[PDB]
Ligand binder design. Structure first.
Ligand SMILES: CCCCCCCCCCC[C@H](O)CC(=O)SCCNC(=O)CCNC(=O)[C@H](O)C(C)(C)COP(=O)(O)O
Ligand code: SF4
Ligand code: SF4
Ligand code: SF4
Ligand code: SF4
Ligand code: FES
Ligand SMILES: [K+]
Ligand SMILES: [Zn+2]
Lengths: 699, 48, 119, 60, 209, 87, 115, 96, 129
């Protein structure tokens, strides 16, 4: 009804009015060369490489910012456009420093490739080049600013995507330099993404510095397990060793960004690893032993002790196959004490209804809502990609945010309604003024963080927010489907566990102390030996022994997310799978294989013997754990609300304080992050000051 | 070398060793890089 | 001739610092994949190979590495009488290549001096 | 004998840094020569799609 | 010259080759599927696999073709195609000093009539295509492995075949024999992913699908 | 003791074959949970899934029961015998 | 579409006929290999291996496939007849130097991370 | 400088020395651990830092084509000395 | 078409016995049909236009002598290319390899506008150039 016809090299293409010349060219397939244009960031038009020729027009237009009009024929390969590209690249390459052998961008440098394709093969520059003093912005991004082409893409990314306005320019002319002027580290959860944004080696990954070349690393696609967003990543490994994590575009989960805890945490999978099985000797000292001895010990203890004295506290980074394997193994000994480190209110519907513990309207739905109400959450650190999506919707759609928890730095400005739990009840009763806004918004959204559920009054908070959702649902201003209630999880191996039937808590252990405990990747340290009865057999199956394995008696080494092909479910309900990039170190094996072999040794052999068989069993327990990259929308909010309005649990007076309220708390959260060294340098950088990040970045 | 002597530098050797194959001064290949994966080094307190 | 291709060797600057900067052009251009390079930022800060192994039993002595090197770090020395009684002695390490560079430096510097203008 | 008596002056490789590496003197001085040398010795020159059968009178 | 680096282009040869391509297309419309002349003046005739014996014979016997020398006979394996194997015949005419290319297609389990009767030089060539790729040529005087070792299992030149194979050789003193074992390399072949993510040649730009 | 360890109802969202199951979970579920507020009745739904009922008993025993094209009363009846068939 | 060219046989029965005569040739041959090639395995110890090789690919049902392995087995017989294979080439059929591999899941889990 | 590990093995410039409880040391007995005594880490340290009197300076490594690609170092920070990324030579402004 | 008593061979094509692949490397492997993701380091999409088929990574240990990446998986560096997903799955079924095809992700068409950088009422107004 509005499509306008534009020509690209003669071909006729229907383009929506407002389409730029670059997108019209992309429709045909031609990719206009560019440096300063990023489809996620704003259009700048300063690189001047998108200069393309329009027929019957004696002026090369900027395809990155020029909207097409009817009858235009974009001559991409015209002689004038080719000469313009050659001149612009000559200007770019004039003052560039001869750092290609020493620059990590070498082999994946946009400048190098565009020079190879759209550019000359020599130089007519017979003068002295410029040189720019390097600038320090922390222990993550090494800056060699003499390589900067001043595309200002990092500045735009910091301003819009990251929110913090600490990057910019200084001066004019050839001496105008991109930096922070005063010394101030670019500290944000999404800071490392600037390394991807920079088309040149001006901004580079410090942990990856001078370690590998782009053409030699094997790329394996996988799913992040640090946070609960489930960002898709590419593990680049060479010589059977993880080298770096890059983002992979998904446009729903993480756009094309990742957090810092996702990027600079691969080193965590190189220290404090469990490689060979450990058993307690006659002094109670952990000693290396063959798999046979440890498995025999565990099998004997499982055979002897049965009933409710058998238990398993699933960890936070565990997969879905291992969870179902452990569930079946403990079910065959009639043990239904499968607990999880995280606590989710089981009162009322509980895990019975999926929508009770799911971010129902998906991450991509945030870009549609008009009012967002976050309750007792700090999405900046709990789920950095979710906060990035909220900011993205805040910029364009002018979405209005409202916080019920403690005041924090959420990049974008929010309206702090307060920090007391009682406010929720007010919004339920309509006494609070914001209720009017909630009833006036056509696409309202209510998000409750899983950290808020960690409190003693989690059931009361869930009941209050469900009352909010029902109150705004009875008024039909909310559109047809528009699932309002949302629960934002933090632990990756939570939703899947809640899908399988694991108890959303650890209270089963305290209520019924078991004489054997299967710590499966459990490192939160919620339950210790003091809570357990004496002479308790503790089994730890994990990769990094930090808070768990020291407590256990058998330290059966498990496999990590980069070392297994396994299913993880994000907070929206989508179930993705990570693929193997490196094999487990030493004698460590896959988690599900360990559980199945233990079941075989103990006698109660599990049916599944292959990964496909375990996936089939996962389908048997839950059919939505195999529909990979498919959000299975839940329903029946009314039933969950009706079951919720029976407990009448009373809110407390303690303010809703998120566990993480500063950058310092974001880094060292899980076992891999704790064992890593770069996150230690990061917490050091943020804690004391700027003096801890000085280094010779000249090379 | 008597007329034109080669340029002198510190790192250049001062005793031209011949083919050291056979003699116990052979060359044995070995990895010149450190470890990649570290171990957990379990604690010493019996505790349990 | 001064262009003769023989035993591979790693040269170094007159100051004493190695010329190699681990740009991995030689490893990326070797037709036989005979070079293995692992790099790591040194204590000073300069990027140098933590491992630079060249497998003489797999090398084809093409000289492509010495052309690819942008700092004239790796060269094919004039030595050709380096036969070994055991196979393992032909698997060159970084230390062995550096020893070759320090041993044949007098010859290799003159050979490059008499040929760099042709390149 | 004819080739020895008719050797012409000129260069040795096609004057195109995208199919022939630049001179070592130019590589260590200029941006484009360094970039082209890097890409040629790491990636190589992209040959246009197609197929050909070229034969010569080898001494066999 | 104005193009000291660009290879000179001959257009008279292009016209002659195009004329002969139309000639061959008109002569045998039964098998000739598509004829094309490359930019560097090489003519390729794509025929139906049933036209292997007839078309070649024509090109060998016609007064206006007189292609009496099978220079090369080879195959190219493209897994993404239905009939992956693509057999190529290169012929040279000494009377009209011209080279021609006749290219046919064939899947894994479809036979091709052996051109040994027409070109007796093909007899060895065919075996190679059988050994390297697995294309079986019916009506062949003797089809056998020509390059691979005796008892080899597989067709090495197939794309779905590792360059290191599956089996290596060793000498075992226990059996005093040159035994074969599963392959196990001391250093795995480092697969380099060298491919610029920027389009090289605008001319060969596949239209979007 | 097969004390009815867990119920798993796997119904499809949109196909008419699970329609009756939907009606059941629409209406005859709140009172069901009120009856026994300990049963982990699982309603894990998925697209393109034949409506089925799994009854995990003690010691890891399961008996799948198909609910294809069942009515709301039909699903109710086919579940009541399951949770009433245990002591 | 569903109907395609044949290699040699025009039905499964003729392919089975060709398999039968190929087995005929191999079974008649085996003792001649044992004597001529100076093998040390017993005659039956080669005939049963011929049987096992025939039984390996006993699941195929596409005729053209059956003709293809008929030709391949004919070629291997051809190599075995006119001493084109040698003692080592023939002995490769009996995988002798290869250590026995385990079949149960438990041993595979004990030995390494493989399917 | 090359130093001796507690086992007796000399450490290379890469900090490589086989552990005491490592069987690989068997290869070195009746042989020697080939190491290079001339450590590049030390040898570049005592090279004097040139007092360049300009804001920026060009380094080619000496010898023109014999050296490394010519790069320009910006000598503006008074707290550090500009070091060439190819050869390691340092430069410093004359007390600014 | 083909007049040689053209026979119906409806049953699906299978060359598992005509490739020479050993027993182990034909079902315990799992190929992966996927369109490679764009290298986020760069900004070119010319490497995301052809489907690729690859095999699961296996054990990669260190050589005791020098430390190489020794492996015993022949189908580790072998990756096929395909013009379309259907052809790739046809190749996978033809060779009898278990697969798990991932759909081709496509960048969603955005809506760029230079004017929004200098808006008067909206929050897209940039604070810098
Ligand atoms: C070791 C030393 C000597 C050197 C090495 C000696 C061994 C060399 C063997 C070479 C031949 C090759 O392995 C096998 C081939 O070509 S074809 C096998 C039979 N496969 C089929 O025909 C497919 C369908 N299968 C059937 O129909 C039934 O298997 C049967 C045929 C039994 C009929 O049964 P019915 O009638 O019940
Ligand atoms: S950014 Fe690095 S690789 Fe790219 S042109 Fe500059 S020095 Fe070379
Ligand atoms: S530092 Fe990088 S991203 Fe920032 S302006 Fe310079 S080239 Fe662009
Ligand atoms: S000269 Fe030797 S080391 Fe250099 S590329 Fe050729 S084979 Fe490799
Ligand atoms: S090409 Fe030269 S500088 Fe680059 S890695 Fe090889 S030896 Fe070192
Ligand atoms: S991309 Fe249009 S000018 Fe930078
Ligand atoms: K970059
Ligand atoms: Zn220098």
């Amino acid at each position: 009804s509005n499509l306008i016809e534009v020509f690209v090299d003669g071909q006729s293409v229907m383009v929506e009015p407002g389409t730029t010349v670059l997108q019209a060219c992309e429709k045909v397939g031609m990719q206009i060369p560019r440096f300063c244009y990023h489809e996620r960031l704003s259009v700048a038009g300063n690189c001047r490489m998108c200069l393309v020729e329009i027929e019957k027009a004696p002026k090369v237009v900027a395809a990155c910012a020029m909207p097409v009009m009817k009858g235009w024929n974009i001559l991409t390969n015209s002689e004038k456009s080719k000469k313009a590209r050659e001149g612009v690249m000559e200007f770019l390459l004039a003052n560039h420093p001869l750092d290609c052998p020493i620059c990590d961008q070498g082999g994946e440098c946009d400048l190098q490739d565009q020079s190879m394709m759209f550019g000359s093969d020599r130089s007519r520059f017979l003068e002295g080049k410029r040189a720019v003093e390097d600038k320090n912005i922390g222990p993550l991004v090494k800056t060699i600013m003499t390589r900067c082409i001043q595309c200002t893409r990092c500045i735009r990314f910091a301003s819009e995507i990251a929110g913090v306005d600490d990057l910019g320019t200084t001066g004019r002319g050839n001496d105008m330099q991109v930096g922070t002027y005063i010394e101030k580290m670019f500290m944000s959860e999404l800071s490392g993404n600037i390394i991807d944004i920079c088309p040149v080696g001006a901004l580079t990954s410090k942990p990856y510095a001078f370690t590998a070349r782009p053409w030699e690393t094997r790329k394996t696609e996988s799913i992040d397990v640090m946070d609960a967003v489930g960002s898709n990543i590419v593990v680049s490994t060479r010589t059977g060793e993880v080298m770096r994590i890059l983002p992979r575009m998904h446009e729903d989960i993480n756009e094309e960004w990742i957090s810092d805890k996702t990027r600079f945490a691969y080193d965590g999978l190189k220290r404090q690893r469990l490689t060979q099985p450990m058993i307690r000797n006659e002094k109670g000292l952990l000693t290396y032993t063959t798999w046979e001895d440890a498995l025999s010990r565990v099998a004997g203890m499982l055979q002897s002790f049965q009933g409710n004295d058998v238990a398993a506290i699933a960890g936070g980074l565990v997969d879905a196959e291992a969870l179902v394997a452990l569930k079946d193994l403990l079910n065959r000994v009639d043990s239904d004490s499968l607990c999880t480190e995280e606590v989710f209110p089981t009162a009322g519907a509980g895990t019975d209804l999926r929508s009770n513990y799911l971010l129902n309207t998906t991450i991509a739905g945030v870009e549609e809502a008009d009012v967002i109400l976050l309750v007792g959450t700090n999405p900046r650190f709990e789920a950095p990609l979710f906060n990035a999506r909220i900011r993205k919707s805040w910029l364009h759609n002018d979405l209005k945010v409202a916080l019920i928890g403690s005041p924090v730095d959420l990049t974008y400005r929010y309206d702090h309604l307060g920090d007391s739990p009682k406010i929720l009840q007010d919004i339920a009763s309509g006494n609070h003024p914001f209720s009017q806004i909630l009833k006036e918004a056509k696409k309202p959204m209510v998000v409750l963080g899983s950290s808020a559920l960690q409190r003693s009054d989690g059931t009361a908070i869930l009941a209050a927010v469900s009352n909010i959702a029902q109150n705004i649902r009875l008024s039909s201003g909310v559109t047809g489907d528009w699932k309002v209630m949302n629960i934002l999880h933090r632990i990756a191996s939570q939703v899947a566990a809640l899908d399988l039937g694991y108890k959303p808590g650890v209270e089963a252990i305290r209520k019924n102390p078991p004489k054997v405990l299967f710590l499966l990747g459990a490192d939160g340290g919620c339950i210790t030996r003091q809570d357990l009865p004496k002479d308790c057999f503790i089994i730890y199956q994990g990769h990094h022994g930090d808070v768990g394995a020291p407590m256990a008696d058998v330290i059966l080494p498990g496999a990590a997310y980069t070392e297994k092909s396994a299913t993880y479910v994000n907070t929206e309900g989508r179930a993705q799978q990570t693929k193997v990039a490196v094999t487990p170190p030493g004698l460590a094996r896959e988690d599900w294989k360990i559980i199945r072999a233990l079941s075989e040794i103990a006698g109660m052999t599990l049916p599944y013997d292959t990964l496909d068989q375990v996936r089939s069993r996962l389908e048997e327990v839950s059919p939505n754990l195999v529909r990979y990259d498919d959000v299975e929308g839940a329903n029946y909010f009314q039933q969950a609300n009706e079951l919720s309005k029976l407990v009448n649990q009373q809110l407390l007076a303690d303010p809703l304080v998120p566990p993480q309220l500063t950058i310092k708390d974001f880094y060292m959260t899980d076992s891999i992050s704790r064992a890593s060294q770069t996150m230690a340098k990061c917490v050091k950088a943020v804690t004391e000051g700027i003096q801890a990040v000085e280094e010779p970045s000249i090379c | 070398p008597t007329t034109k002597p080669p340029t002198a530098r510190k790192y250049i050797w001062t005793n031209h060793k011949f083919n050291v194959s056979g003699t116990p001064q052979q060359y044995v290949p070995y990895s010149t890089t450190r470890k990649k994966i570290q171990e957990w080094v379990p604690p010493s307190t019996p505790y349990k | 001739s001064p262009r003769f291709r023989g035993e591979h060797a790693l040269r170094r600057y007159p100051s004493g610092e190695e010329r190699c900067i681990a740009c991995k052009l030689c490893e990326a251009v070797c037709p036989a994949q005979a070079i293995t390079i692992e790099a790591e930022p040194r204590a000073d800060g300069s990027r140098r190979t933590t491992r630079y192994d060249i497998d003489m039993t797999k090398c084809i002595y093409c000289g492509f590495c010495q052309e690819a090197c942008p700092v004239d770090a790796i060269v094919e020395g004039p030595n050709f009488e380096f036969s070994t009684e055991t196979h393992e002695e032909l698997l060159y390490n970084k230390e062995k290549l550096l020893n070759n560079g320090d041993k044949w430096e007098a010859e290799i510097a003159a050979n490059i001096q008499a040929d760099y203008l042709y390149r | 004998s004819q080739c020895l008596n008719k050797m012409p002056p000129g260069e040795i490789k096609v004057d195109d840094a995208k199919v022939s590496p630049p001179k070592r003197a130019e590589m260590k001085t200029s941006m484009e020569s360094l970039i082209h040398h890097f890409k040629l010795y790491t990636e190589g020159y992209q040959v246009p799609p197609g197929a050909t059968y070229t034969a010569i009178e080898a001494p066999k | 010259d104005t193009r000291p680096t660009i290879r000179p282009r001959n257009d008279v040869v292009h016209k002659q080759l195009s004329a002969f391509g139309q000639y061959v297309a008109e002569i045998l419309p039964k098998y000739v599927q598509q004829v094309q002349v490359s930019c560097f003046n090489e003519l390729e005739i794509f025929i139906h696999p049933d036209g292997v014996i007839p078309v070649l014979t024509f090109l060998r016997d016609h007064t206006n073709a007189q292609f009496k020398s099978l220079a090369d006979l080879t195959a190219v394996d493209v897994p993404t195609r239905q009939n992956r194997f693509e057999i190529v015949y290169n012929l040279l005419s000494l009377r009209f000093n011209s080279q021609i290319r006749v290219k046919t297609y064939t899947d894994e389990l479809t036979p091709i009539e052996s051109s040994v009767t027409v070109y007796k030089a093909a007899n060895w060539y065919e075996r190679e295509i059988w050994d390297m790729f697995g294309v079986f040529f019916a009506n062949h005087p003797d089809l056998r492995r020509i390059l691979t070792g005796y008892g080899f299992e597989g067709h090495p030149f197939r794309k779905d075949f590792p360059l290191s194979g599956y089996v290596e050789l060793r000498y075992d003193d226990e059996v005093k024999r040159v035994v074969a074992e599963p392959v196990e390399l001391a250093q795995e072949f480092r697969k380099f992913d060298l491919n610029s993510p920027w389009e090289a040649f605008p001319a060969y730009r596949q239209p979007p699908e | 003791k097969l004390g009815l360890r867990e119920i798993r109802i796997h119904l499809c969202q949109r196909s008419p074959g699970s329609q009756g199951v939907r009606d059941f979970i629409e209406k005859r579920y709140v009172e069901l949970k009120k009856a026994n507020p300990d049963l982990p009745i699982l309603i894990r739904e998925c697209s393109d899934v034949q409506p089925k009922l799994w009854a995990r008993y003690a010691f890891g025993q399961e008996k799948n029961v198909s609910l294809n094209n069942f009515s709301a009363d039909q699903v109710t009846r086919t579940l009541e015998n399951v949770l009433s068939g245990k002591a | 579409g569903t109907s395609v060219k044949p290699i040699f046989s025009r039905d499964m029965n003729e392919a089975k006929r060709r398999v039968r005569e190929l087995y005929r040739a191999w079974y008649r041959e085996v003792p001649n290999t044992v004597h001529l090639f100076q093998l040390d395995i017993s005659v039956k110890q080669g005939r049963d291996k011929v049987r096992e090789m025939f039984m390996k690919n006993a699941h195929v049902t596409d005729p053209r496939v059956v003709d293809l392995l008929v030709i391949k087995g004919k070629m291997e017989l051809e190599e075995t007849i006119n001493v084109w294979k040698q003692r080592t080439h023939i002995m490769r059929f009996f995988h002798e130097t290869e250590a026995p591999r385990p079949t149960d899941f438990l041993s595979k889990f004990y030995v390494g991370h493989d399917p | 400088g090359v130093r001796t590990s507690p086992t007796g093995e000399k450490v290379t410039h890469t900090g490589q020395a086989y552990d005491d409880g490592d069987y690989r040391r068997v290869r070195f007995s009746d042989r020697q651990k080939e190491v290079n005594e001339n450590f590049a880490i030390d040898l570049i340290a005592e090279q004097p830092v040139s007092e360049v009197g300009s804001r920026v300076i060009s380094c080619d490594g000496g010898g023109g084509a014999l050296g490394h690609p010519r790069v320009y170092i910006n000598l503006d920070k008074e707290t550090k000395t500009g070091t060439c990324g190819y050869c390691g030579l340092q430069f410093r402004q004359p007390h600014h | 078409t083909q007049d040689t008593q053209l026979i119906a061979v409806d049953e699906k094509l299978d060359i598992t016995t005509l490739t020479g692949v050993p027993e182990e490397h034909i079902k315990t492997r799992k190929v992966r049909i996927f369109v490679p993701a764009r290298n986020n380091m760069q900004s070119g999409v010319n490497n995301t236009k052809k489907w690729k088929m690859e095999f699961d990574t296996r054990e990669r240990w260190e050589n005791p002598l020098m430390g190489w990446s020794s492996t015993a998986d022949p189908l580790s560096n072998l990756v096929l290319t395909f013009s379309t997903k259907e052809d790739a799955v046809a190749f996978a079924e033809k060779n009898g390899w278990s697969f798990d095809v991932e759909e081709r992700k496509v960048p969603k068409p955005k809506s760029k506008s230079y004017g929004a950088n200098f808006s008067w009422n909206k929050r897209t107004r940039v604070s810098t150039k």
